[PDB]
Each structure stands twice: as structure tokens, then as C-alpha cells.
Write a protein that binds this ligand. Structure first.
Ligand SMILES: N[C@@H](CCS)C(=O)O
Ligand SMILES: [Fe+3]
Length: 186
């Protein structure tokens, strides 16, 4: 029985319930993530920016089955084209806008990766992806507004691949946390 999260803290408790079992109900998780109305005061602690690239800020370690983090995107900051390591990825906008560009898994042959589609995620919207769906790139294309997003991954993962848009070639990346629980972690 899914209720509206009243606050970020509330959202986290609900996520522990949802992941209390071995199976994820994706539409339910996406629904509750969406239902949370972004309140900048609730997550300001986690919203730590870097001048040159986007940052990953851990919010909750989950119950072994997931974790939850906040990503902060300066003007013009974006990601690589990437996968999600056989895990669920949920992404919700907390501030600003992000452009999400979808790509298919590349064939063996070296080829331009052509955009399958793109969309603009606006404040409070929650997107979902997993490897069965495809790959994506996420970008703050604004010249004037920073962006902030909330990401839920299940199971947790700290590695993934980046794909070269010219060739489809992948490289394994290890991701780092800019902060954990509000604390900068160099
Ligand atoms: N999964 C990547 C990009 C956002 S979905 C990350 O953790 O930085
Ligand atoms: Fe992603």
C-alpha cells in the first residue's frame, strides 16, 4: 500500500519497506519517487556542486538491496553514455532540467551510436532505466540553471561502462562519491 512521501526522510522509510522483500516492484518504486515533491531545504545538505563536472552524493545506504544518492549538475554538465550494471536505475529531478538521450546497446562492429530518442526531464519527474531497456546519457544543457537529481539503484553498484558515441566501444569506470550523508569525501 503506497502512500505519498511527505518528506525526503519519509521517502527513504518507504523505500526500505518496498525493498523489504527480494523483488522490486518497479512501477511502485517509480510512483513513490515521483510522488515526493522536491523540497530544496530537505536535500540542500546533499546538493554539493563541483565547478567542472557533476557530483554524486550518497543519501542512504539502503538495506543491502539498494541505495539512494543525489547528483548535482552545473550548467553544461553531463554524463557519458552509460549502462547500469544489471541493476535498476530510477532518476528523479529535484531542481532544474536534464536532457536524457537513449541509446541502444551497440553491435560488435564499430559504428556511430545514434540517438534512439531524447527527452527533457523537468522538476519532480522520475525516469527509469535498466540494461534490458538500453543505455543513456544525462546532461544539463542549460546555460543559466544548475540541476539536481535523485537516483535509486538496486542492487547497489559502483562500476559501470561509458560508451564512445563515435564507435560504441565501452570502457569500465569506477564511480566515486563526492559526499556521503552530507559529508564531503575526497
Ligand atoms: N549512474 C550514473 C549516472 C546517472 S544514472 C551515476 O551513478 O553517476
Ligand atoms: Fe544512468
Amino acid at each position: 500500500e503506497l502512500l505519498k512521501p511527505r518528506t525526503l526522510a519519509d521517502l527513504i522509510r518507504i523505500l526500505h519497506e518496498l525493498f523489504a522483500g527480494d523483488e522490486v516492484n518497479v512501477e511502485e518504486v517509480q510512483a513513490v519517487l515521483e510522488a515526493y515533491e522536491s523540497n530544496p531545504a530537505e536535500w540542500a545538505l546533499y546538493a554539493k556542486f563541483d565547478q567542472y563536472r557533476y557530483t554524486r552524493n550518497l543519501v542512504d545506504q539502503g538495506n543491502g538491496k539498494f541505495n539512494l544518492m543525489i547528483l548535482c549538475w552545473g550548467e553544461g554538465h553531463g554524463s557519458s553514455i552509460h549502462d547500469h550494471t544489471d541493476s535498476h536505475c530510477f532518476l528523479k529531478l529535484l531542481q532544474g532540467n536534464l536532457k536524457e538521450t537513449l541509446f541502444d546497446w551497440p553491435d560488435k562492429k564499430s559504428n556511430e551510436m545514434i540517438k534512439k530518442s531524447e527527452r527533457t526531464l523537468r522538476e519532480n519527474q522520475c525516469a527509469y532505466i535498466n540494461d534490458s531497456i538500453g543505455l543513456h546519457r544525462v546532461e544539463n544543457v542549460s546555460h543559466t540553471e544548475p540541476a539536481v537529481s535523485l537516483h535509486l539503484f538496486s542492487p547497489p553498484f559502483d562500476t559501470c561502462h561509458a560508451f564512445d558515441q563515435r564507435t560504441g566501444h565501452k570502457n569500465k569506470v569506477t564511480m566515486t562519491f563526492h559526499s556521503k550523508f552530507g559529508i564531503r569525501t575526497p
